[PDB]
Design a protein around this ligand. Structure first.
Ligand SMILES: CCCCCC[C@H]([C@@H](C)O)n1cnc2c(N)ncnc21
Ligand SMILES: [Mg+2]
Ligand SMILES: [Zn+2]
Length: 325
């Protein structure tokens, strides 16, 4: 399994695809069998293997473990985690995060991306609370139920024998790695994003400051959120396709909420849901602000905001006679 992975060395990024390091590249085009390899390539391209002296066999096992630690709902599967991770790599390469963040922080972000939805069951935090799941029992009172479970699953993978990519770290770094991984994964929750939004705008107002450690915090949260939503930054074929997976998942939960006598949200109810207006609402309230904050901090992230705005134009366009339900 893992010996087969490292039986030919770490492939360079250009050999996977020539446009691999570009924003136009859709990582979902890469076959699922070649994705663990692609992770190793990105980690070596960012020079994280040398920097933190990550043992390669251990990194390979960790990667394969993170992979099988996802289930197979329509959207929250390994391929989502992979595409979010690829996008984090695109941010490194194109927005040059090395000028803004510490190396250990960009490393944490990438690792977080791989783990950020570990063991997702195709349902959200409200459903866990509502169905009295053990996850809700463990985490509901602190908030962000699934997010704490994801981090917890990351930890259980990192402490599996032969997967501890941090085992040799200094005490100070091992700890910062743990704090950042938790904070970055928690940041993926809409509720969290809704809190720090005021502080994100103020950061974008005054200008980014490498000496301000709160700006690092907040920048990491914004970056994570923008990797998580990166399906909205590709072409219409990708974005239109991914909407089908998202609602496929949402509609399953909606059915399960009905079977326990709960009234699902409109977006979860296929009898109520008109996808165009829902995505338009998602695009303007959540997605476009996120990428407009990313543009304000990185002028080079202008082409991402436009493609999200474009995709929101495409929803209005195709609304003319789109499937009514
Ligand atoms: C700032 C954090 C936003 C979190 C929302 C995540 C959410 C589901 C799929 O988890 N999601 C992700 N893409 C979505 C989309 N195109 N339409 C509706 N919901 C979406
Ligand atoms: Mg999540
Ligand atoms: Zn996600």
């Amino acid at each position: 399994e893992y010996t087969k992975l490292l039986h030919d060395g770490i492939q360079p990024v250009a050999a996977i695809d020539s446009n691999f390091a570009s924003f136009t590249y859709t990582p979902r085009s890469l076959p699922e069998d070649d994705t663990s390899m692609a992770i190793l390539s990105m980690l070596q391209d960012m020079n994280f293997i040398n920097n933190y002296k990550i043992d390669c066999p251990t990194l390979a096992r960790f990667c394969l473990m993170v992979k099988k630690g996802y289930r197979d709902p329509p959207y929250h599967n390994w391929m989502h985690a992979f595409s979010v991770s690829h996008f984090c790599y695109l941010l490194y390469k194109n927005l040059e995060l090395t000028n803004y963040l510490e190396d250990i922080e960009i490393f944490a972000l990438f690792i977080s991306c791989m783990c950020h939805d570990l063991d997702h069951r195709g349902t959200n935090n409200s459903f866990q609370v509502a169905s009295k799941s053990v996850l809700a029992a463990l985490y509901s009172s602190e908030g962000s139920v699934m997010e704490r479970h994801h981090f917890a699953q990351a930890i259980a993978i990192l402490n599996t024998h032969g997967c501890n990519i941090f085992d040799h770290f200094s005490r100070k770094d091992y700890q910062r790695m743990l704090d950042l991984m938790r904070d970055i994964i928690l940041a993926t929750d809409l509720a969290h994003h809704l809190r720090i939004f005021k502080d994100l705008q103020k950061m974008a107002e005054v200008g980014y400051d490498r000496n301000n450690k709160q700006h690092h915090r907040l920048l990491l949260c914004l970056l994570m959120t923008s990797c998580d939503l990166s399906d909205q930054t590709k072409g219409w074929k990708t974005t239109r396709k991914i909407a089908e997976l998202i609602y496929k998942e949402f509609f399953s939960q909606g059915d399960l909420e009905k079977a326990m006598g709960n009234r699902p949200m409109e977006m979860m109810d296929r009898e109520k849901a008109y996808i165009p207006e829902l995505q338009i609402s998602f695009m303007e309230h959540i997605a476009m602000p996120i990428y407009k904050l990313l543009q304000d901090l990185f002028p080079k992230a202008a082409e991402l905001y436009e493609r999200v705005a474009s995709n929101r134009e495409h929803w209005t366009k195709v609304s003319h006679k789109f499937t009514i339900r």
